[PDB]
Assembly symmetry: C3
Homo-oligomer: 179 residues x 3
Amino acid sequence: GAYDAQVKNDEQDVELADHEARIKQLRIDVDDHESRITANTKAITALNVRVTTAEGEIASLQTNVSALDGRVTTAENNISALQADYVSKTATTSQSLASPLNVTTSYSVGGKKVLGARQTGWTAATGTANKGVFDADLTFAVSDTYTQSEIQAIANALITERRRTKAMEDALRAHGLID
Amino acid sequence: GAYDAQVKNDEQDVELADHEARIKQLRIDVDDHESRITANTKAITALNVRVTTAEGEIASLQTNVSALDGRVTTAENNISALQADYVSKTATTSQSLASPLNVTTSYSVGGKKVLGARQTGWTAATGTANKGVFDADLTFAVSDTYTQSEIQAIANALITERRRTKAMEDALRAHGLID
Amino acid sequence: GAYDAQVKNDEQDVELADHEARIKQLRIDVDDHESRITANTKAITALNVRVTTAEGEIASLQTNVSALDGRVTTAENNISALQADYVSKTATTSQSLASPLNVTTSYSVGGKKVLGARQTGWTAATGTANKGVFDADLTFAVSDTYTQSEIQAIANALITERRRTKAMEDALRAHGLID
Ligand SMILES: [Ca+2]
Ligand SMILES: [Cl-]
């Protein structure tokens, strides 16, 4: 024996040196891991803040877009109602109102004034109005001597004429062209 | 010799105690690292879910905003067309339609009715219409004895008057104030 | 003694074997940690890219939504102005314009034409216009013999009638129904 002990101590020393080197490298690696995962934890923590902020802006946006969608839908329906109901300056097909109409100063057709303000200062004619048979080519016989029937005919036609003047006046008054 | 072996065993023991303490601390650190990085992995996994969900809401929003942008542009163009084409209640400059106009009941100027419904019940006058020279200050000589020429003058002026009544009636009919 | 050295070497061997096994397991764990935290670092790095991209799309959206909000508000105010100012085809309450009106071809009431283009070709009557007292039931005495006063009465009433024709013509001209 004797020799075996020296051999054993040397080989134990060899293993000790191997353990020492491997522990050193483990220590290096773990010290390296400590810093890096700590950095990751801080990076993850910071990311949650940003994601939370973004979530706070997305649900806000989703609400505003929904509100705007409602406003535009309302607007589109107001436009559609107007489009069907408004009186156009350019439309060529005759347009009709369900109401009376009042305008300032004049009504015109094709750019020339045809209707204005009511003409006042009229005293309404009285008597009979003639809207019946009326012949403007009615003539009258006039002899060289006085004939009652011929003067009666003239007077009769004067009456029918005055009664037709009143009838026309009545029509103007009823419309409102004169007072 | 002899002594060297005891010295060697003691110093080997010293190193063994040092290795034992350092292995213990490594074990502590690595066990600590195991839990923490596992927590980070779970936190990263959870973050991907939230980010994916948010990405799912952002591309959706970008589509809706684009669709609303198109709707509003369409609406703004419908408004612009109306603004230029509509008849205003407050505008003071004369406004013109490219079409005929129909209204209920009346036309008014300055708040007083000047035009209404067509007046009916008329029998159209026949004969000549006089829209020519007409003097309302025309007078007539009347002697104390019968004079044919003086009665002819009266009859002649009655005819021109009846023919002017028809002319005026013709104008009213053509417009449509009377039937 | 003697025996103690063998006992010491064996127990040192026992500890060496224990250290060797624990170092092996530490090495396994740390090699496992190396890969996993590296994966986490890459995953965190990739997440920052996506979050940055999303942040780049959210502030963009917040700007567009704000711009659209301004456009719709502007549109809603243009609609409100129109709603109050436009002339309705269906409204039944009388509507009034602050301006004159011009139309193509005709004005109608209740679907029948009552007003058209100005009637031309007229020669304006001259003299006095009579808008005063006028009795259409005025009659005339006609004797069987010539009576100056009776012919004067007829002539007088013819003058008042011709002067009333001019007055009516004057009213039509002033409105614009005739030239
Ligand atoms: Ca030993
Ligand atoms: Cl990690």
